[PDB]
Amino acid sequence: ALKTAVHEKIMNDVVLAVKKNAEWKVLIVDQLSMRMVSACCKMHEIMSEGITLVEDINRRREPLPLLEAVYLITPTEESVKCLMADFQNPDNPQYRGAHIFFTEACPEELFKELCKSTTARFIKTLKEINIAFLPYESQIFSLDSPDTFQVYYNPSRAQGGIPNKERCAEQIATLCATLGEYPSVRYRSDFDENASFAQLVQQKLDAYRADDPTMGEGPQKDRSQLLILDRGFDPISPLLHELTFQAMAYDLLPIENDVYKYVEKEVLLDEKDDLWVEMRHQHIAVVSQNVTKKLKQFADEKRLSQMLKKMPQYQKELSKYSTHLHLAEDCMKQYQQHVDKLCKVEQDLAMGTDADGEKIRDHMRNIVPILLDQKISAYDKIRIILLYIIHKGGISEENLAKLVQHAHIPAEEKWIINDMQNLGVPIIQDGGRRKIPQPYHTHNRKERQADHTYQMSRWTPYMKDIMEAAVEDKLDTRHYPFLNGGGGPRLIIFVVGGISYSEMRSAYEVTQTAKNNWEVILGSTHILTPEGLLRDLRKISNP
Amino acid sequence: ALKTAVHEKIMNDVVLAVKKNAEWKVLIVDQLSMRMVSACCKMHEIMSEGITLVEDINRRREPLPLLEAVYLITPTEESVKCLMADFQNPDNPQYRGAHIFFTEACPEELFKELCKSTTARFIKTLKEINIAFLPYESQIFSLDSPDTFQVYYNPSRAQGGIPNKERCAEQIATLCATLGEYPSVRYRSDFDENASFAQLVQQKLDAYRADDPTMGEGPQKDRSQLLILDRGFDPISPLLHELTFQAMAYDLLPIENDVYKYVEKEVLLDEKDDLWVEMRHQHIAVVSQNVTKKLKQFADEKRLSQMLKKMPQYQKELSKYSTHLHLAEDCMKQYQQHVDKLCKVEQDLAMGTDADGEKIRDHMRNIVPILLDQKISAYDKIRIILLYIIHKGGISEENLAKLVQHAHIPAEEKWIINDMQNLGVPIIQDGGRRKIPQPYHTHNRKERQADHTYQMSRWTPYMKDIMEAAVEDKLDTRHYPFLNGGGGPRLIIFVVGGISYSEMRSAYEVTQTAKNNWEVILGSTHILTPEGLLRDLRKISNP
């Protein structure tokens, strides 16, 4: 797991490497850093390694003059300045000394400014653990750089983007490093910025191979490939209304920064929550169902001072079981409120052949009735239109202008449809240009029987197709060439422009199947969400 | 059950008697009324009888001009005024008309004030269901008159008490009525006010027999007895630190008006809570234990629109299971914090023979060490001292003065010990008076093997002894005579001065055992609590 890799560094290269002589220190982390720490290890392991306290470099906290401090922060202005402040004045510093562990090489501009600080004296250590990415999940990582979307798709952003682009490379490089992998680069050639990008990625990791010959060590590690994909390789998947717990939850519910508040108790959906890790990839159809089947299975495993301890945790269990039903409930509600409705139109559009493989009255049918539905929202309608246009392979400046009217889609959201083009997708019918392909459409992909256990869930992400090929070592190269030559093992896929939970799900499935011992790791600039993707297209024409 | 009796009236004399012509009405209840309603019937039965809504006469609620309203309230100023306000102005009343069902005959002073109100017009009905008591539990009722304690034990309250005393009679009379019982009166003769009181009780229920010959109808109802006891019949039980869930909970936790708030969600411990009804009478030793054994047993009994309903209640279940553990936890904590400690001294004192039937170093031993314990509280110490004095059968003005000092018991609480005497209990050794008995002491009661499964729980309330006799029809009469002659069936015990949960528990046990089909119903002026009893003795010398 990528999870394990990070967990390793944090303990073996930070907490333990500093733990010395029955003493005590404070652990200072920031926004991002705390994120990954809290994703790979539990305080327990940390606190019980000489870490009396843990807290945010920013949020001001109480001084501890006689204690060494371990700073595990990112080379950002904010953090570095907050650091410099903690020792902005000797003869009154807080924390006896300072052990600095940067998340990634520090800017020579900032680094140099730190060396000319009153803080330079207290610095007893100075390293960086090379972790420019967030271990979002066991098999998923995020560069947390949603702006790259712009850099990549906003025309008036091209020049003055290299900085941003290569930082992603840099970031991606540390993912490979942290995994002890020196993979073969491949990229979808149907979009040009890809090859260009593919380069920086190589260069960045060539450099990493230098500072460590262990990167890509014997065994299977060599059959490993790093495939770079652009968002345009599949505009459908990211738009659909998925009905698997995790996928669905984040689309219909208001879950800010992975935290689900409900009717006020709030809970964080995280790797740490075992239940969540075992439910996120399941159909609402059976969620509530299996959730309770789990509750019991749990009870059967519980059959005066030593007991007054078995309690605090027995309470925790019950709570998980409540929030998940409670979570799966909010879902089931929203579905009936209007979603099932859209799921029919959408599936038919993405499948090209509804439930019984017919065709459809495509051109202005099923659509309009929905587009008028006064209950359905603006974005819901935009999603249905895009999927619609995508199916037609394009549409006239005219017709499009029509659909947009029957939907009463505001002016401010009008362009979102249009810009989808910047990703490669053919939206405006003629435009008098060079024809554009669509590898993601059902008809151009290997057939899969039309026996889907659920009708509202008929679609499969092209992404999965791609994985299943790469894994069985049969992914075409006129479309997904190797940077030059080549061809765990580990399959590293990177989508510049965001990825969907359905795609994240897929990685898991492929990884937990005919896996020739293969493991698929999906990562991206950011984690996408239907409306998220929409807001993202929006920023190109209205930043 | 007394439960059934009340349930009957509420439906057959209120909800049904008003349910007419496919229409709808609102049910308006108050603090007390809602209590008993929620103890005898579930909304289901009510809501599905033309009761669209139920709510508190006080808490202001929305108007429903075209709906009749059914008021089931008590003849109190608060309620009657709130009523009079609902129609304080015609041409803008809320609720088309009004059906008033008083809990008990309304004061001619208040009643008369209601007749001269703008509300008099809207009154389409006016009755009272004759319930001058609180059906606390399935087998316990309370007159909710804690002041009677004073009337009975405060010397300077005797004259000018008859009013209060006979209202209790009146109240007790309606308990017998509501139960269709015309029982034989008996009273502990060792305390004089008893016979005196016994009288009013007879008279009050003679009167009730008049207005209804059905009171005491054939079958077993005639073997039924109403035994009147004074608090002094057992000063021990009420002082002990009981370790059965309910008993314990109310003593160590801060549970105002039967509502347990914890760490803020709050919950009401009530007959309606099935779990509570099945746990209140159990030893902490096994509470948490059986509680979880129940959780599972529940899960095994749960194995998309019709399901989005099975949810709202499945959530309720989980919550019960949490609050009870959570409740039983707060208990287990307190126990270790200091209680176990006291439980040893106390038990030894009340038993006269600790765990292994020895004797003890009684006179100033075990006591003092505790009396100094800076952790233990003032009341805890007072409890230990009383139990101590009670064991000695009394103590010198001197010694008592000593104990009180080693304990640093404030002046304000000093007398509580002394006044315990007003109840008959011999506290000041000599006093130069007529010797006083103690029927409750272990040695004067039938033997019971010293094989108590728990050491901290060795004591049995004399009260139980009394029941087990009356039931097997063998209760002595030189001490518990019949008002004159005589001798369900139903055993009605009434303690003037409060009753303990341990005693409440006992009634159940006796009722659910060798019961010759007998049922024991325990009732009192109020429900006692160790510190409660203390505060009660306090008011005699410092009202």
Coordinates of C-alpha atoms in Angstrom, one line a residue, chain B residues 6 10 14 27-41 43 46 54-58 70-76 79 101-104 129 131 133-135 270 272:
Chain B
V6 CA -54.8 4.0 33.9
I10 CA -57.2 7.5 29.1
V14 CA -60.9 10.3 27.0
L27 CA -54.5 16.5 22.5
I28 CA -53.2 19.1 24.9
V29 CA -51.4 17.7 28.0
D30 CA -49.1 19.3 30.6
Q31 CA -46.1 18.3 32.7
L32 CA -47.7 15.8 35.0
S33 CA -50.5 14.6 32.6
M34 CA -48.1 13.8 29.7
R35 CA -46.1 11.8 32.2
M36 CA -48.9 9.3 33.0
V37 CA -50.1 9.2 29.4
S38 CA -46.6 8.3 28.2
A39 CA -46.5 5.6 30.9
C40 CA -49.7 3.8 30.0
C41 CA -50.2 4.1 26.2
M43 CA -48.9 7.5 20.8
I46 CA -53.7 7.6 20.4
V54 CA -50.2 16.0 21.0
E55 CA -48.5 18.8 22.9
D56 CA -47.8 20.8 26.1
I57 CA -50.5 23.2 27.2
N58 CA -47.7 25.5 28.3
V70 CA -58.9 17.8 23.9
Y71 CA -57.3 19.1 27.1
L72 CA -56.1 16.4 29.5
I73 CA -54.6 18.6 32.2
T74 CA -54.4 19.0 36.0
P75 CA -56.5 21.6 37.9
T76 CA -53.4 23.8 38.5
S79 CA -52.6 24.8 33.3
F101 CA -60.6 16.4 31.0
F102 CA -59.2 17.4 34.4
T103 CA -57.0 14.9 36.1
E104 CA -59.0 15.3 39.3
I129 CA -60.8 11.2 35.2
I131 CA -56.5 10.4 39.2
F133 CA -51.7 10.4 42.2
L134 CA -48.8 9.8 39.9
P135 CA -48.5 6.3 38.3
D270 CA -39.4 6.0 31.6
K272 CA -41.7 3.8 27.7

